[PDB]
Amino acid sequence: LDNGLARTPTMGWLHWERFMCNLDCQEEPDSCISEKLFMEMAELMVSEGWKDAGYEYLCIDDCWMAPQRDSEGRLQADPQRFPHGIRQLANYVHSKGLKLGIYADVGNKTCAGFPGSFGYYDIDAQTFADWGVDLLKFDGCYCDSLENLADGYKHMSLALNRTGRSIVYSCSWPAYMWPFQKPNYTEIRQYCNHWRNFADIDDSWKSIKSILDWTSFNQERIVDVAGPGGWNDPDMLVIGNFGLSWNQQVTQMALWAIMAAPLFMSNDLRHISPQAKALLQDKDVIAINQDPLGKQGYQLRQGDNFEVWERPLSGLAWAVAMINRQEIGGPRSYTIAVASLGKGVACNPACFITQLLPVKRKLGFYEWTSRLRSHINPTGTVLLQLENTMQMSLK
Amino acid sequence: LDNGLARTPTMGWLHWERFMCNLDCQEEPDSCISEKLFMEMAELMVSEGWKDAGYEYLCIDDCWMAPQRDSEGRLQADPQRFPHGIRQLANYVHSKGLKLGIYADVGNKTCAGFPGSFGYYDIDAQTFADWGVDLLKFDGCYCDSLENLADGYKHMSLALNRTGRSIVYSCSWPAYMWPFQKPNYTEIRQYCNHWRNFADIDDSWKSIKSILDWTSFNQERIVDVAGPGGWNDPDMLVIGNFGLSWNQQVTQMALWAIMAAPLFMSNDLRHISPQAKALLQDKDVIAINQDPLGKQGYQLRQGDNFEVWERPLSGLAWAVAMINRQEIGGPRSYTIAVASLGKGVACNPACFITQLLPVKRKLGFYEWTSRLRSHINPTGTVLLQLENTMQMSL
Numbered sequence: 103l104d105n106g107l108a109r110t111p112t113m114g115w116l117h118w119e120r121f122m123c124n125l126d127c128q129e130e131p132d133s134c135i136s137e138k139l140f141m142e143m144a145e146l147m148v149s150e151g152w153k154d155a156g157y158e159y160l161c162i163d164d165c166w167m168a169p170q171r172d173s174e175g176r177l178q179a180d181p182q183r184f185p186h187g188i189r190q191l192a193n194y195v196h197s198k199g200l201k202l203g204i205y206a207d208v209g210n211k212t213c214a215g216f217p218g219s220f221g222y223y224d225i226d227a228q229t230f231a232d233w234g235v236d237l238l239k240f241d242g243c244y245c246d247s248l249e250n251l252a253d254g255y256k257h258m259s260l261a262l263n264r265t266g267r268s269i270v271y272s273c274s275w276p277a278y279m280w281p282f283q284k285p286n287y288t289e290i291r292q293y294c295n296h297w298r299n300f301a302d303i304d305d306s307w308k309s310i311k312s313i314l315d316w317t318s319f320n321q322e323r324i325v326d327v328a329g330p331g332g333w334n335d336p337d338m339l340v341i342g343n344f345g346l347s348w349n350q351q352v353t354q355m356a357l358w359a360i361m362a363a364p365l366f367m368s369n370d371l372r373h374i375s376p377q378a379k380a381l382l383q384d385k386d387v388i389a390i391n392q393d394p395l396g397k398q399g400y401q402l403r404q405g406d407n408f409e410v411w412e413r414p415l416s417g418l419a420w421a422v423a424m425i426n427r428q429e430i431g432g433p434r435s436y437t438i439a440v441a442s443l444g445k446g447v448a449c450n451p452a453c454f455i456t457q458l459l460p461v462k463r464k465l466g467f468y469e470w471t472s473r474l475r476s477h478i479n480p481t482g483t484v485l486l487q488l489e490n491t492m493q494m495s496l497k
Numbered sequence: 498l499d500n501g502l503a504r505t506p507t508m509g510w511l512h513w514e515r516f517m518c519n520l521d522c523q524e525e526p527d528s529c530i531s532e533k534l535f536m537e538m539a540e541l542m543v544s545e546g547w548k549d550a551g552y553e554y555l556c557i558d559d560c561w562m563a564p565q566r567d568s569e570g571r572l573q574a575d576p577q578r579f580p581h582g583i584r585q586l587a588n589y590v591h592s593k594g595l596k597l598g599i600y601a602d603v604g605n606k607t608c609a610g611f612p613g614s615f616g617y618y619d620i621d622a623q624t625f626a627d628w629g630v631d632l633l634k635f636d637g638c639y640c641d642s643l644e645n646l647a648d649g650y651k652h653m654s655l656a657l658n659r660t661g662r663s664i665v666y667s668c669s670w671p672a673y674m675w676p677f678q679k680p681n682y683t684e685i686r687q688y689c690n691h692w693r694n695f696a697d698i699d700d701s702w703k704s705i706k707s708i709l710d711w712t713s714f715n716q717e718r719i720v721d722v723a724g725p726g727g728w729n730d731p732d733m734l735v736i737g738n739f740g741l742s743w744n745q746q747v748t749q750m751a752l753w754a755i756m757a758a759p760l761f762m763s764n765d766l767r768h769i770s771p772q773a774k775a776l777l778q779d780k781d782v783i784a785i786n787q788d789p790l791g792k793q794g795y796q797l798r799q800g801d802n803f804e805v806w807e808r809p810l811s812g813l814a815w816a817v818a819m820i821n822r823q824e825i826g827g828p829r830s831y832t833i834a835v836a837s838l839g840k841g842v843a844c845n846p847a848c849f850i851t852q853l854l855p856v857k858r859k860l861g862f863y864e865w866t867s868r869l870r871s872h873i874n875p876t877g878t879v880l881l882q883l884e885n886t887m888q889m890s891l
């Protein structure tokens with residue numbers, strides 16, 4: 103989308119996976135969806151260095167709204183869970199140097215059952231612009247036809263544009279087209295900053311794999327459309343929660359960087375392990391994600407329960423991810439000829455290889471004819487940065 | 498099996514899940530299957546308090562043997578990887594106060610492709626007993642028929658008995674039956690100390706769940722056959738490895754205790770996190786597993802992605818496990834009437850409830866009529882001990 107936004111993938115925090123549609127502030131004041139929840143996250147996004155790592159969008163997902171529009175036809179913040187309304191909350195966030203994200207639906211209702219924006223796109227756009235919203239996740243639920251789907255999405259895109267305010271526009275458009283409807287990514291790209299392609303993530307290795315596989319399987323179709331201002335969204339980072347082994351967390355962090363995915367953490371910033379924080383704030387990995395060339399990576403090859411993914415980076419450098427998919431035994435030795443990497447350019451005449459995950463370690467120079475041996479934990483990933491020796495010498 | 502063994506579920510360590518059939522000692526001397534591997538584990542089983550927690554069987558799984566029987570038709574330790582042979586290794590293990598487990602197969606070949614025991618049951622039983630083996634895992638691979646399967650298993654059972662040596666006998670009999678037909682556990686129980694029911698575990702939550710679910714589904718046929726001298730084997734504890742979140746590890750430790758499963762860790766004792774160690778050596782949980790009454794627990798109820806399991810313990814006590822099966826969101830609140838627990842006796846008139854996992858914490862006295870509220874992490878488990886208050890009078 104040509105709104106000057108999301109020149110690199112958008113980073114931030116989104117409540118959904120972690121917190122869902124929890125409306126019980128009486129029994130569960132600390133994890134029901136409320137202005138309090140977001141304010142707490144906002145403080146911690148600053149105090150815990152999340153803002154500095156690049157996480158800047160604090161995003162409200164579904165179930166922030168009251169059950170109907172006000173007498174002027176505007177969506178309303180739930181009166182008991184957002185007593186000071188969205189404006190004040192946006193103000194709060196802005197005072198922190200962060201930006202605010204919000205959630206709406208293209209159809210008659212949000213997925214949770216709250217007011218959809220169908221028939222209110224302009225009102226809703228204007229409402230969001232005025233509150234000072236900076237990002238909108240626009241979901242596909244409760245849409246009667248694909249014609250409508252496509253229209254609503256395009257309409258909201260213009261409606262937002264017309265408000266004159268910069269708002270990152272996130273469209274679940276393509277996801278609601280799958281499996282039998284080949285979405286037009288050229289068209290989607292034009293209206294959206296990023297787009298959800300596939301099913302909702304959750305706190306499981308199953309789900310991660312499902313996403314990785316769906317992505318690689320569908321790669322020719324989607325990798326090349328992605329770039330500055332328009333990204334493929336494989337959903338929230340779920341690192342730091344409950345259902346992932348450490349190795350699996352690493353794999354997500356690694357692969358989301360390779361895939362140039364937006365980085366929306368969904369977790370409790372109040373209770374997050376020093377490791378998780380370290381991984382999610384990993385500055386070399388984040389740099390790979392945020393590489394300014396903005397070229398999404400791909401699966402290079404797979405077999406014997408290994409996968410190799412690689413991503414071209416600015417400076418003719420390359421990210422390389424090696425995933426051990428075998429879920430039994432111990433660290434498994436993997437060997438690849440550096441010649442195969444970076445379509446044979448990465449390491450010609452040589453390349454310097456730095457390992458980034460699971461730990462940062464310099465591995466030195468590999469001539470183009472040489473082989474790289476790794477040991478990769480079951481469900482883990484080794485992330486690598488290749489520096490071509492030629493470009494290195496150049497200052 | 499009436500050999501006086503496994504009066505409580507057998508505890509120990511088994512190489513397979515962690516180490517598999519790794520035959521490359523040249524490229525991987527520290528994790529190929531060798532006498533060195535087992536000796537290291539044996540020292541650590543002592544030095545790291547594993548023996549004291551109750552882990553006493555050091556077990557060799559598949560790929561210890563050479564590719565043929567010697568001229569006397571005996572199974573042989575791989576000459577390169579077990580240069581001093583099994584005898585010396587058993588001696589070593591015994592000197593530590595530990596016992597040795599070994600692996601054979603009822604068919605023509607072990608699963609990995611090495612010599613099976615079909616046609617050599619007596620020879621093999623005698624070979625093991627000679628060496629000083631104390632436990633045999635007997636696998637089901639490469640068997641032509643179920644008739645044979647059943648026979649080989651019964652034969653090895655007697656063959657072992659005839660050697661006169663105490664050997665825990667572990668049979669994968671029922672697991673290789675389930676594909677073809679319903680296994681007779683009365684029969685199995687007669688010949689075996691424990692038995693693998695299900696598919697192989699691995700380093701995944703997917704696999705644990707599949708095991709828990711398969712068991713709960715089939716609990717009618719299997720829970721009651723289990724008892725002193727004869728146990729259901731839901732396979733190795735994989736805690737402390739790579740593919741499980743902490744909550745999932747907790748769930749395995751909890752549920753294997755509820756299930757009165759044998760406890761065979763499969764991990765690297767050389768590199769195991771303080772936490773894993775602590776969980777696996779958790780002495781209140783191990784006590785529940787090792788409860789002398791030897792009654793296996795069961796799933797009590799399930800729904801809304803919660804499961805409640807419970808197990809009767811001696812002293813009219815009860816273990817209760819609550820599993821949060823919902824794999825999205827955060828800790829989820831669960832509430833049960835203590836009246837439902839322990840077929841309405843556990844808490845009548847009252848019970849004192851101790852939480853054991855994820856952390857140990859005294860919850861207090863609960864009347865018959867009261868409700869217990871918990872918060873359980875996604876894929877986690879809360880493990881509970883209930884003491885009936887009448888018993889704390891006495």
Ligand SMILES: *[C@@H]1O[C@H](CO)[C@@H](O[C@@H]2O[C@H](CO)[C@@H](O[C@@H]3O[C@H](CO)[C@@H](O)[C@H](O[C@H]4O[C@H](CO)[C@@H](O)[C@H](O)[C@@H]4O)[C@@H]3O)[C@H](O)[C@H]2NC(C)=O)[C@H](O)[C@H]1NC(C)=O
Nearest residue numbers: 103104105106107109260262263264265266267268269330
């Ligand atoms: C509403 O929609 C309109 C129409 O699509 C949209 O207008 C577009 O805005 C973008 C971004 O501001 C314009 O692109 C710019 O064009 C100028 C001049 O040609 C360039 O110099 C700009 O360069 C920037 O981007 C570089 C990275 O590529 C940076 O390095 C540099 O520093 C600059 O920041 C930039 O490419 C685009 O031309 C217009 N299109 C039209 C037809 O006018 C508008 O932004 C939307 N409004 C809102 C609020 O969403």
Ligand SMILES: *[C@@H]1O[C@H](CO)[C@@H](O[C@@H]2O[C@H](CO)[C@@H](O[C@@H]3O[C@H](CO)[C@@H](O)[C@H](O[C@H]4O[C@H](CO)[C@@H](O)[C@H](O)[C@@H]4O)[C@@H]3O)[C@H](O)[C@H]2NC(C)=O)[C@H](O)[C@H]1NC(C)=O
Nearest residue numbers: 498499500501502504657658659660661662663664725726
């Ligand atoms: C070969 O197979 C035979 C037959 O299956 C098997 O003989 C059995 O050995 C068991 C275990 O030693 C005997 O059971 C015990 O018998 C004595 C004497 O009657 C009892 O005191 C025992 O009662 C209990 O108390 C003990 C407390 O210390 C416990 O250890 C015990 O588990 C009981 O709770 C116990 O019942 C049994 O008598 C014979 N059975 C027959 C029919 O002979 C033999 O052990 C096998 N050999 C090998 C080496 O495996």
Ligand SMILES: *[C@@H]1O[C@H](CO)[C@@H](O[C@@H]2O[C@H](CO)[C@@H](O)[C@H](O)[C@H]2NC(C)=O)[C@H](O)[C@H]1NC(C)=O
Nearest residue numbers: 252256284285286287288289290291292293327
């Ligand atoms: C996918 O949609 C895009 C955008 O609507 C299409 O590309 C445009 O096609 C129109 C004609 O319908 C042309 O006027 C434009 O020149 C095209 N845009 C650009 C910038 O190339 C595209 O045809 C669609 N693809 C398919 C296969 O339907």
Ligand SMILES: *[C@@H]1O[C@H](CO)[C@@H](O)[C@H](O)[C@H]1NC(C)=O
Nearest residue numbers: 209210220244245246247250
């Ligand atoms: C919502 O409901 C109306 C009334 O039935 C229907 O005509 C309209 O097309 C629906 N909108 C969408 C996008 O599903």
Ligand SMILES: *[C@@H]1O[C@H](CO)[C@@H](O)[C@H](O)[C@H]1NC(C)=O
Nearest residue numbers: 603604605615639640641645
């Ligand atoms: C072992 O192989 C032989 C020869 O092929 C066969 O006759 C015999 O029945 C097999 N036994 C088992 C238990 O599979």
Ligand SMILES: *[C@@H]1O[C@H](CO)[C@@H](O)[C@H](O)[C@H]1NC(C)=O
Nearest residue numbers: 679680681682683684685687
């Ligand atoms: C189990 O097998 C035994 C043979 O040892 C037999 O006597 C008995 O009838 C079988 N029990 C059932 C329930 O089929």
Ligand SMILES: OC[C@H]1O[C@H](O)[C@H](O)[C@@H](O)[C@H]1O
Nearest residue numbers: 118163164212213214241302
């Ligand atoms: O109901 C809210 C929920 O709706 C859809 O399923 C989206 O894909 C989720 O990410 C979340 O926004």
Ligand SMILES: OC[C@H]1O[C@H](O)[C@H](O)[C@@H](O)[C@H]1O
Nearest residue numbers: 321322323325326399400401
């Ligand atoms: O460079 C883009 C291009 O790179 C590789 O060849 C991939 O297989 C393609 O799917 C595409 O992503």
Ligand SMILES: OC[C@H]1O[C@H](O)[C@H](O)[C@@H](O)[C@H]1O
Nearest residue numbers: 513558559608609636669697
């Ligand atoms: O090859 C060894 C392997 O053999 C079978 O598959 C068993 O069920 C496993 O637990 C393991 O012992």
Ligand SMILES: OC[C@H]1O[C@H](O)[C@H](O)[C@@H](O)[C@H]1O
Nearest residue numbers: 715716717718719720721795
């Ligand atoms: O006490 C044993 C008995 O307990 C419960 O009722 C289970 O549903 C049965 O399958 C059986 O295990």
